[model samples]
Target: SAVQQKLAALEKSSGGRLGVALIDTADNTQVLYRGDERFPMCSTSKVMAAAAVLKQSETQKQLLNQPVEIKPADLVNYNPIAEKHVNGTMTLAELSAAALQYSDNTAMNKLIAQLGGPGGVTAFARAIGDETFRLDRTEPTLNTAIPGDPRDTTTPRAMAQTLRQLTLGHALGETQRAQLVTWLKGNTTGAASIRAGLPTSWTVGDKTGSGDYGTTNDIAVIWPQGRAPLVLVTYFTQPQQNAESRRDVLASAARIIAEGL
Candidate 1:
């Protein structure tokens, strides 16, 4: 397999493990490389955080519009958006945008708090038929990415399948799905990741995550002009402690996936 050969070389040169899942919605073209391995989710968990909120909104109805106040205590490190709104109020939808588009730590916490903790998000994943996605802690702690620890981890296939549901499947309501897609498109975090591997003619909506031990991840729904959509998940992790994450690794993997399938 040319794809396996290329990916093997990449893993060797980069000194990190790469787990990937690529799926074509139209023809069901699929590919996997270490797709079942667990990797620390980092901020990529925010995508599920946002989707879980939307899923609840379907039943709660007023959930999205409800205003929640942000206080000094609610703010976390790297909470740019929530910091600006300290002691102010924003709707669930607004907070979701902050989390997904800006990776705002405070906003993500607020969403998790709304769902009653990490369990709520995990429950949503289960409801969507993905048992492999799990969230066990809050920000900062969740990004620890300790080797072999399963807390706050998701397999490439699990995350990609869940994204398929949220982005192109029936996991979310029509309006809610569109809203998630919009936030992903507006994301400011993934410039050099999977998006970098694609041609300008294509469109991509992605959620990116970074953690200790060289963990970097991006899960996305991509559309090539006039073609069927694709869902791609790439997770990279190095064995060294405090390893520097390289976006080029993800970009290279994306290029291989794009070219091969």
Candidate 2:
């Protein structure tokens, strides 16, 4: 209850919509404030994409080893690593890392293609029983975060639930889950949000998203010292023009969310 009140006040003062979900896997203690509201997935959608690729790889065997050539046409805004490898080749596994660790837009586009398109990624989420997580567009376009548009969105609860399932539930093969976990833990983009709020001794694996309309999000599976893992998802959005995101708000939110446990 204290967590709920503090989060509510934080959202109101920030003048933005905040969607949060924190689950303690040991006993399943949870706080789902605005957990049902949909928020833009932005690059966070890559988590689902990578999971789908891993699932497919289970049967395809060669999928991870398969190299797909990268062309200049696949480039999109914010494609740092992908830009360097244009007219080159990157395996699906490499693309998965680039997308998650570097938030490389172009690498995401390639992975989307591997999954057979955005619809394919959506299907994967659905199969995992996360009907609330959907992907409707590719990178750059999906990052729009236009108010009221439900495309490429996921509820905070659904995002956290899916992450929990993949990382700690039975929804994914152990090998696949391990790969996904590795990628998430190696991510380079979340230092300012949930990771920033956490104690230095704890271990964390996270994925972050940022887009237009002040949309910024971080979803993490945190392992507190000598405790069960915690799944936390924090999403913030505002419709005002020139809307901006505050990492400090998310960081403080993380601290408060953890305190509840």
Candidate 3:
């Protein structure tokens, strides 16, 4: 298939490890391209954390507008929300919006804390059947990823599993699922990757991840013309500074993937 050919080309074009998982709603089967390989999941892990928070809302009947104070300790220098904020209070909805739309590391840290910590977040994902997503550190430790360890890690297969479920509105209450989908659609990040590859007549709701070296990941529900929407997960690790090449690979792969459908 043209999609498979272009994807193979993309893997060669990408500088390092590449993993892809695509769900064909047509056959209800998953296709893998290094799908189970582990890779660092930088900001993209925010989506998993978002999962835990939304589920908390379901079980706790938590109000999104309820005030949660941002502690001074949660402050981090890498992203917005925290960059502009001092010690303060904000609603869960507000914080989540900043984190999701802008990929705010600080706001993410606050969210992890609200869920009781990294272990709690991992536990939440595990209970939901996430087999590959792992959260072993908080935002403050992101700069120090170990040789054999990642602050957060997930496989392409796992990401696809998560997104497919989320896109179908699983694991979350009805209203909460809609709200979460809305939040994901509000994503202003990854404009040059999967989002850019999409045609004018189509759109995708997705989350992106990038690390200091060359890890690029986007998990999305892509709505293509005259076809059932599909779940697309692309995870790669290359040089951190090859932003243009990485984005191009994603953009190129996405275009072909859509057309082949």
Backbone clashes under 3 angstroms, per model: 0, 0, 4
lDDT (0 to 1) per candidate: 0.90, 0.89, 0.75
Candidate 1: segments with Cα more than 4 A from true spot: none
* Residue-by-residue lDDT tens digits, candidate 3, 19-122: 78889777787777787777777777788787778888886786677787777766776667766666668888888887888888888887888888889888
Q: Tell me how candidate 3 scores on lDDT.
A: 0.75
**True-vs-predicted CA distance for residue 35, candidate 3, Å:** 0.5
C-alpha RMSD of each candidate structure in angstroms:
1.0, 1.0, 2.3
TM-score head-to-head 2 vs 3, winner? 2
Worst 10-residue lDDT window, candidate 3: 142-151
- How many Å off is the CA of 121 in candidate 1? 0.8
* Residue range 1-261, candidate 1, lDDT tens digits: 899889889889999989998988888877888888998889999999999999888889889999999999887778888888888998999999999988998889999999899999899899999999989999878999999999999998888888998999889999889999999988888889999999888899998889899898888889999999999999999998789988899999999988875
Taking the tens digit of each residue's C-alpha lDDT, what string does model 2 give over 82-159?
788889988999999999999999888888888889999999999999989889999889988998899999999999
TM-scores of the candidates in the order shown:
0.98, 0.98, 0.90
Off by over 4 Å in 3: 71-73, 143-151, 239-245
